[model samples]
Target: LQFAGVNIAGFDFGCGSDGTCNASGAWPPLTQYYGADGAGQMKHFVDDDGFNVFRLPVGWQFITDGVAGGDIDEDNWAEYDALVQACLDAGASCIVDVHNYARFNGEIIGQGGPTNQDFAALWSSIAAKYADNDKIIFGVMNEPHDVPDINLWADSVQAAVTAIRQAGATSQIILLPGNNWTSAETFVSNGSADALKKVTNPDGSVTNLIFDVHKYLDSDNSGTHEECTTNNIDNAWAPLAEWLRCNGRQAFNTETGGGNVASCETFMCQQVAYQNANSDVFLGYVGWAAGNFYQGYVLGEVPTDTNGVWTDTALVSACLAPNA
Candidate 1:
């Protein structure tokens, strides 16, 4: 219930393959194409939009290599460190998101591939690196899906959370997401809600573990196109809100945005207003993207004017208008 935010889509630390950053250690690297300049963009979001939180997604394979490589690449680590430090320096809370969709190089973490302990090792190392910084938050994983056993997935997440605390990261908050791309629409029915409820902290309590969910206004909720559908706030989010309230849980919409079209603009505004009205369970909302993007990216809601002086697009202006 603290900070409203946005997701920095590009610069998923070393996942870019346009020959900018070194992508050696990553398994089948080249996961993404572009990346943001670190410091300037962090400052831009914090100073320009009054956003208090920024979610930075990173690839698990990009961090450490596959099952063969052990630790994070030094070059990749340095780039990510600088970006995270920039967020902290700008007084914004940063969520280090593992954006691998619960896998490393086409294999699930706990389902006959990389074991749960392997996932734990990944978080342990990451937690140890940021143990001293309270502004840094850990997102266990992003949009895990297709695993046969949901409880096993919960077990893996619990192991990672336990490892994080043991690495001396007990203070900062941790965001836990569930399967089916963490879709609010399918959260309860897809068995994510029931399974993820079993993920506990180091002390066997569920405190400080915020449920992370991402939903889009697109018809299919995939966020690939620009069209917006009706009743998403009522049909998609209302059930999620009821579930959260019933279970006494808190959630944050770490990713949600649409194009600058009229339908998208109206849907985005209504969603934010709905969250604002239900701030008791909904901590905050973050627009889909705002970093290293050029003029034509579908979800590029933030303006790119160079010279550290950026402006807001129509969608971004609506995102900023909830406080009014």
Candidate 2:
């Protein structure tokens, strides 16, 4: 249960595309691109960026490609496999993020739309594909909110975890997040914390489950802005760290960062430091950036140049540090 010095400081390599937008515009997740270009770029993140983990956010619709069956589209699955293998080959952990907001084609799973079994089936196929690779971690879903019930959403997550284990993919870490975009600030107050605490493995043990949380340093705690505020470490994160400690659970900041702005530098650096200082419960953090992104991306960290150079910002440098 100890990170021992292997703090998972890294960047999120997104994979969203043009037509993946939801009604709230949250469905089309920001992507770092995927496929051959993504694989080639990942090597640089591992070697040049000095990151030990790369978060690959995938569009569920892209994986399903408008299909009815629970199976992943072969073509899309191949592209993801190549990039995931590239991360592993570079000696880094790869988080295969199902970047959907608990929805499929704009339909919320288990909330009057796609059944929870449909969601579980997707994980079963994914688990079977990467059954042997422990380096690949499974994120059940991304930011599930606006559902009929948080408890049902928890049930969906549990189904996915159970399917992964039933497929014989034991020993891989599974990250589960609460509703309201898994916001750390409201995790306890919003009831996502209590509901998600009930998610368990098929054997009834809750081991190897890391609570995935995302917190930005913006005024609204959303990653859309380049502006920053300073109280996140003391205000948002401190309570979360305490909650994890008291609950005897571990967590991962799967997403958190800002654009290359002056306001973000100091606060973001301290956020990573906070996780590093609490390695017993905080697995680590991955900045919200890098991959197929061109200039003007709000949270851009790594550049799009072929050399794979990162921006010389304080946040990027701190993430590259050994102890970050």
Candidate 3:
């Protein structure tokens, strides 16, 4: 099936944390806990701003509650269900993301049990829970971490995808990432097609899985915007772009941001240029955020009070929407 479409913009719901509350409203600065109900805030932006997509970042561990393949936490589900339903009500295409900050939640960067069988079971449970809903999309993992290799991570993701299919996810579009860096230039960092081929629905139907990559210009240097233009976004990114040029594959620039206004504009314009240059191959792009400070900041402008509440309408106007 083929259809023509213009640029589609979406919002990433940064409603993830360790899943707890801080003692005081001003705790995170001194002593704060990671809470999970930020979805309410995200819904506000999505509905009020006419965002067509909502990337809901969910901590599987919170739902799993350290139980491995345990039952879905009803509280978490209620919140998530309400969120998804809200997206439907607002007429937004929602991306139900499997969020893991930096690395994975329990898996850690190089330690923890990321490859543990329990993780696969946890995904199975999650896929099954939302299997019936076509509006929900599956993001295998946020940014997979220091795995042995991209192939290794792909293998693990394949297992999770299989589990999702076995549980009943039919044609839902699943999002997989390169490494966690979201570099378009690193081919090796991205997993191989061998592992991706293994994912299949119960009836042998394959899910519509797309490659997910983050797009940050100067995240390493506080939003300098220098790296966003050149292919050297990261170490292995250039080689990866070469590989993509050689082999026909698609990538989604799912996360890119800049602190400097000019830098943000440059990054967005450069990406739009790249897309125009390679429109045939490049699938699409999603800015870092719809409401945040720098990395995922999308409101209007950073607040001077530093109360975590700020707006950046300029940022949104410059980087949030897609290029026509």
For TM-score, the strongest prediction is 1
lDDT ranking of the models: 1, 2, 3
- How do the residues 143-252 of candidate 3 rate in per-residue lDDT, one tens digit apiece? 55445555556666767777877788776777776553444544343454435445454566543767666645654522333334432333433444555556555555
Give lDDT: candidate 3, residue 30. Answer: 8
Model 1, 1-324: lDDT tens digits are 367777765545454321122335332211132344545555666676677887777676556643412377776676677667777887888999887777666667788667888788888889999998888889988777677788888888888899999999989888888877888888788888878888888677888888888888888888988877753676767888899999999888888888878888777777787888888888888777776556687887645556757667778776543344
Write model 2 residue lDDT over 1-324, tens digit each, in one string: 122111111222232322233322222222343122445445555666566777777666657765523778887666566667766887887788877677665567777557878888888988998888888788887776666688888888889999999988898999998877888887777788778899999889888899988888888877889877863777768888898899998888787888676778777777676777788888877777655455577876654444655334455755433444
lDDT of 1 at 319: 55
Per-model TM-score on C-alpha atoms: 0.89, 0.86, 0.69
**How many pairs of residues in model 2 come into backbone collision?**
3
Candidate 3 wrongly placed segments (more than 4 Å): 1-51, 101-116, 189-207, 219-242, 291-312
Candidate 2 residue pairs in clash (backbone atoms < 3 Å): 14-31, 14-32, 15-31
What's the TM for model 2?
0.86
Which pairs clash inside model 1? Answer: none
Predictions: Cα RMSD each: 4.1, 4.6, 6.9
